[PDB]
Design a protein around this ligand. Structure first.
Ligand SMILES: CO[C@H]1C[C@H](O[C@H]2[C@H](C)[C@@H](O[C@@H]3O[C@H](C)C[C@H](N(C)C)[C@H]3O)[C@@H](C)C[C@]3(CO3)C(=O)[C@H](C)[C@@H](O)[C@@H](C)[C@@H](C)OC(=O)[C@@H]2C)O[C@@H](C)[C@@H]1O
Ligand SMILES: Nc1nc2c(ncn2[C@@H]2O[C@H](CO)[C@@H](O)[C@H]2O)c(=O)[nH]1
Length: 300
């Protein structure tokens, strides 16, 4: 007998209650704070992703995300998870076998690999994919019950998050001033909102073996909001040169821009410290909290 991390009999029973018969190899990622993620082989010979909510508060988010993905499926020129099972105890979809655009071993803080800076096929196809996403009509998002933020509501959300961090943590004075100046800088903010992925970075983008964007995953944060939300992580990974290329092609592909978009994306990236701190706070995880407090107290 060999102790294994996965509980195959419990997983089998869970999947079977939702019409999936597990058979063959599986792998398990238990490091998620909200979900256990298992990639399992099913009697169709195919791999499926089992996205297992850990708690009632997580389970509550399944049905609204299911409506998002159902709406998006025909309206994007790339794949998204096909949640053929979606309920409080289990989400399951056939695995999208294409690689993520960043490969990282669970537990590790350093990726094995990220799609290269000089990959023109990746850069170009990410920009067009993003323009396509941001072209999904607002009416479709409303009809699907999505969270909608007008430009005023988008800016208010940022203000609320900044204020919550200020109430719970002690933040470097210059950091605070940066965020406030940004919130007060009318010219930075867009006068429209779009359907955004909300958690978009190389780890949630799938690519075919030519490095062309073929899919996106992990849509929990999707909503109608500030377009720049989906561009900040591109700046973080690919730098100002990568952002410059993105904006040129995004605009050429029909994406709507505004003159201070590049600036606004950089401010959104800085605002990532707020998002991280609130995640840490809401998680109750002391390691995340220690990192967050250190970041917030530090000079940029
Ligand atoms: C938009 O700007 C981003 C910039 C940066 O975005 C992050 C990323 C994506 C964050 O994840 C996001 O963290 C938030 C809190 C929740 C979110 N979702 C689960 C909901 C999650 O995906 C990280 C904090 C994940 C984390 C903690 O495990 C790590 O420490 C790992 C090692 C992480 O550094 C890397 C693999 C590097 C190579 O990735 C990047 O820098 C991207 C660009 O960190 C953010 C918090 C900002 O929001
Ligand atoms: N290639 C690929 N990875 C996935 C898929 N679903 C989940 N993952 C991985 O599991 C994590 C949790 O959803 C993601 O960040 C990916 O690393 C998928 O359909 N295809």
């Amino acid at each position: 007998t060999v102790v294994t991390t996965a509980d195959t009999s419990q997983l089998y029973a869970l999947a079977a209650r939702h019409g999936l018969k597990l058979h063959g190899p599986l792998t398990v990622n238990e490091l998620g704070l909200d979900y256990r993620i298992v990639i399992a082989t099913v009697d169709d010979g195919r791999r499926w992703v089992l996205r297992i909510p850990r708690r009632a508060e997580v389970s509550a988010k399944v049905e609204p995300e299911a409506r998002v993905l159902a709406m998006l499926k025909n309206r994007l020129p790339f794949a998204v998870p096909d949640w053929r099972v979606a309920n409080a105890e289990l989400v399951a979809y056939p695995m999208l076998e294409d690689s993520t655009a960043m490969v990282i071993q669970p537990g590790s803080s350093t990726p094995d690999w990220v799609v290269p800076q000089d990959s023109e096929v990746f850069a170009e196809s990410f920009a067009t994919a993003l323009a396509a996403l941001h072209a999904v009509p607002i009416s479709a998002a409303v009809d699907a019950g999505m969270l909608i933020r007008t430009p005023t509501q988008a800016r208010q959300k940022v203000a609320d998050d900044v204020d919550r961090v200020r109430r719970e943590f002690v933040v470097n004075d210059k950091r605070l001033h940066r965020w406030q100046r940004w919130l007060d800088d009318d010219s930075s903010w867009p006068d429209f909102s779009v359907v955004v992925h909300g958690d978009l970075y190389v780890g949630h983008v799938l690519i075919d073996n030519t490095e062309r964007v073929s899919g996106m995953i992990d849509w929990s944060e999707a909503r109608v909001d500030d377009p720049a939300i989906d561009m900040a992580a591109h700046l973080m990974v690919f730098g100002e040169e990568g952002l410059a290329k993105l904006l040129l092609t995004y605009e050429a592909a029909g994406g709507r821009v505004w003159p201070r978009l590049a600036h606004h994306i950089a401010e959104r990236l800085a605002f990532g410290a707020v998002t991280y701190a609130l995640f840490a706070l809401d998680s109750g995880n002391e390691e995340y909290l220690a990192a967050a407090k250190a970041q917030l107290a530090a000079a940029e």
